[PDB]
């Protein structure tokens, strides 16, 4: 017989025909999948009295456990079974209710923000419901669904109940972001934005996808704070960190201004004792809202290569050593310019200074390399100034060795961040980056948490899915949609710190990047490692930046340029194509295909709604949802594996069946040059920076050791091609 416990408590006999019908439905259109295999593996686990939901997890998991490269379509079988289950958990049926009734009920329960029903009429929700296609839920892969269920869909944390499905999330994110639009265009923007996200053309951060439509206004996940050389600024910085990390934001901290150990008695304060005890204080600030002090809370801290304490700073992440000499749970970015590299090449010395002993040096380091050179050599000669000489090879070696040990000592080329930048360095220099080394924005130290004259940089992020577009001219519409949606969010979200609001309202900075780059190269028959992708990349990133700029330009005409537009190089009619590292000419010869001179005059005249538009971030969550390769990165392998309380989650790279030979896996790359040449080419067009990795397979090298000579050449290659930052260093194990 076999009996089943229904949702409530009642019992009826098992329906093997019903299970079979759902599986048949799930398997429609798929290839190389066995319904009977799934049936065999799950039915053997059933027992008399099994509850209904438990039959569902079992069949889902049975399908999920057969996901492999030879049968990739089990991703889709398991996904659809999971979707079905979730429809029932949410709606008690497979058909979702009308959009209006759904929203009404959610407002009643306190799960959706009630502004939605104020901003739109029943007629308008009826209309929005005609835009929706719930069948697009059928396009998710299994790992996509586990991501939706884990962190996107509105749900009860305690009880486990799920309250919505993916298309409702998509339509209502759209409805919220365009809610202030004139009735004449509002619903057209909504439909078009909904189509773009629901067909994966545009990807959005988790805070946005989980929160927009709900009563929260906390959507800032990327913040940059610069610390001044004073206890008041140290305290303010610390306080701003605590405030933001409680909202799960990643932090970039610039702390290179703090005077070195031993420095003169500041008529009260206590900077005799050095940078490190304050770094420790920034760490506990970053960690103040983390489960047991570990999981959650992330920051990267920045300082110049020539800081008097640099040798102590470089080894903060090192395991062995006295606990007072270590600050292990933050990453670091070492700031470098052309002169520091020159001393290395010429086998000369580098002079270390405390920023407090060298008037103007810190400022010039970022803003003006000629003044840096003048002031630097001058101070090297003044024997009245406290200083320390080190061999450049020893300083670089130490840095590169620590970069290698931890993978988490990063690099920022501060000259490149200011010579090739949307900002005039005399007014608004870029003096740091963020957690992930793609964000590059101006900052100003705070007096006090509430100092109205400080500036904390914020950035709103998104990405174009390069694999979901048939051609580059689709980017025109996608850029309009993305820029408008993100710009609206700036007015919508909250600002817990006055100085952060200043940055956001002043500059209105966006950071739009890409996902599925690897897949896109593969299906165009190119590779990372051999230079074959160079011209295609040039062409691709021109299109992105041109269309991004055009959308923002058009938005400025309609709504007004950003308050502080006059501080951009854009205001002076200067474009990315004017200021890029000239060496790029030797590695690509793709012509510009778009009319940049027309755009130039249109920018001089009407300005930009946004001071920045582009940044190339890493992705994991949003690329898993699209079944996209992550960011600009080559996949480590054809099948991705993740652990969960629900079983092993597998995801196969898109179109493995037809592309397995076209892909170039991370470790198939003979070396770093081809990838770095692509990063350099992208950077020609990108406003901010790129989360560029370097990679090293010990087994490619004599006696299994990566030579320092190679580590340094790649560093110089990065610089020579104008790469602004270097993020994670990946060393393969085994």
């Amino acid at each position: 017989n076999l009996l089943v416990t229904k949702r409530d408590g009642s019992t009826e006999r098992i329906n093997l025909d019903k299970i079979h019908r759902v599986l048949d439905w799930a398997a429609e259109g798929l290839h190389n999948v066995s319904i009977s295999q799934v049936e065999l593996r799950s039915h053997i686990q059933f027992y008399d009295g099994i509850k209904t939901s438990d039959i569902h997890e079992t069949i889902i998991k049975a399908a999920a456990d057969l996901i492999s490269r030879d049968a990739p379509d089990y991703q889709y079988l398991a996904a659809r079974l999971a979707i079905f289950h979730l429809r029932k958990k949410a709606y008690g049926q497979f058909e979702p209710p009308a959009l209006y009734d759904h929203v009404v009920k959610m407002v009643e329960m306190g799960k959706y923000d009630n502004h939605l029903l104020e901003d739109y009429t029943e007629e308008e929700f009826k209309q929005m419901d005609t835009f929706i296609d719930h069948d697009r839920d059928m396009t998710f892969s299994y790992a996509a669904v586990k991501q939706l269920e884990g962190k996107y869909l509105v749900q009860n944390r305690v009880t486990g109940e799920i309250y919505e499905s993916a298309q409702f999330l998509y339509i209502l994110v759209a409805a919220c972001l365009f809610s202030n639009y004139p009735r004449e265009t509002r619903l057209q923007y909504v439909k078009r934005f909904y189509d773009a996200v629901s067909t994966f053309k545009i990807s959005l951060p988790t805070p946005i996808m989980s929160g927009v439509r709900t009563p929260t206004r906390q959507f800032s996940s990327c913040v940059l704070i610069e610390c001044g050389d004073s206890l008041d600024s140290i305290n303010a910085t610390s306080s701003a960190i605590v405030k933001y990390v409680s909202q799960r934001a990643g932090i970039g901290i610039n702390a290179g201004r703090i005077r070195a150990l031993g420095s003169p008695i500041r008529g009260g304060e206590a900077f005799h004792t050095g940078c490190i005890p304050f770094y420790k204080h920034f760490q506990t600030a970053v960690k103040s809202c983390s489960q047991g002090g570990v999981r959650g809370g992330a920051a990267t801290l920045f300082y110049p290569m020539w800081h008097l304490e640099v040798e102590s700073l470089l080894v903060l992440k090192n395991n062995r050593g006295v606990e007072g000499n270590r600050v292990r749970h933050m990453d670091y970015g070492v700031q470098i310019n052309k002169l520091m590299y020159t001393r290395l090449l010429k086998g000369e010395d580098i002079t270390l200074f405390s920023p407090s002993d060298v008037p103007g040096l810190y400022d010039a380091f970022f803003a003006d390399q000629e003044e840096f050179e003048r002031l630097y050599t001058k101070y090297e000669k003044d024997d009245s100034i406290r200083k320390q000489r080190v061999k450049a090879v020893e300083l670089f070696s130490l840095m590169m060795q620590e970069r290698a040990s931890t993978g988490r000592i990063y690099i920022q080329n501060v000259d490149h961040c200011n010579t090739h930048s949307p900002f005039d360095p005399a007014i608004a220099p870029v003096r740091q980056s963020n957690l992930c080394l793609e964000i590059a924005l101006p900052t100003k130290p705070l007096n006090d948490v509430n100092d109205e004259n400080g500036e904390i940089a914020l950035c709103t992020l998104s990405a174009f899915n390069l694999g979901a577009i048939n051609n580059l001219d689709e980017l025109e519409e996608l850029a309009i949609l993305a820029v408008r949606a993100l710009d609206a969010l700036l007015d919508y979200q909250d600002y817990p710190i006055p100085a952060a609001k200043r940055g956001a309202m002043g500059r209105r900075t966006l950071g739009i990047g890409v996902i599925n780059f690897a897949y896109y190269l593969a299906k165009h028959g190119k590779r990372y490692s051999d230079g074959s992708a160079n011209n295609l990349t040039h062409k691709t990133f021109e299109a992105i930046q041109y269309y991004l700029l055009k959308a923002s330009n058009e938005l400025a005409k309609e709504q007004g340029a950003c308050p502080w537009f006059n501080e951009t190089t854009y205001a002076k009619g200067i474009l990315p194509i004017d200021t890029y590292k000239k060496d790029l000419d030797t590695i690509a010869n793709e012509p510009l295909h778009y009319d940049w001179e027309a755009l130039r005059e249109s920018i001089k005249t009407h300005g930009l709604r946004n001071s920045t538009l582009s940044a190339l971030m890493p992705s994991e969550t949003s690329s898993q949802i699209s079944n996209a390769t992550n960011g600009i990165e080559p996949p480590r392998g054809y099948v991705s594996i993740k652990a969960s309380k629900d079983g092993i989650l597998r995801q196969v790279v898109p179109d493995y069946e037809h592309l397995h030979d076209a892909y170039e896996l991370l470790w198939e790359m003979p070396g770093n040059d081809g990838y770095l040449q692509l990063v350099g080419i992208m950077q020609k067009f990108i406003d901010q920076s790129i989360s560029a990795n370097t990679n090293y397979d010990p087994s490619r090298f004599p006696s299994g050791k990566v030579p320092m000579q190679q580590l340094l050449k790649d560093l110089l290659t990065a610089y020579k091609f104008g790469v602004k930052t270097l993020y994670y260093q990946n060393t393969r194990d085994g």
Partner: peptide
């Protein structure tokens, strides 16, 4: 894991 010896001669050639 890493080999720390550096040839300064071979580096000096490079063009920033």
């Amino acid at each position: 894991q890493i080999d720390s010896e550096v040839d300064t001669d071979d580096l000096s050639n490079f063009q920033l």
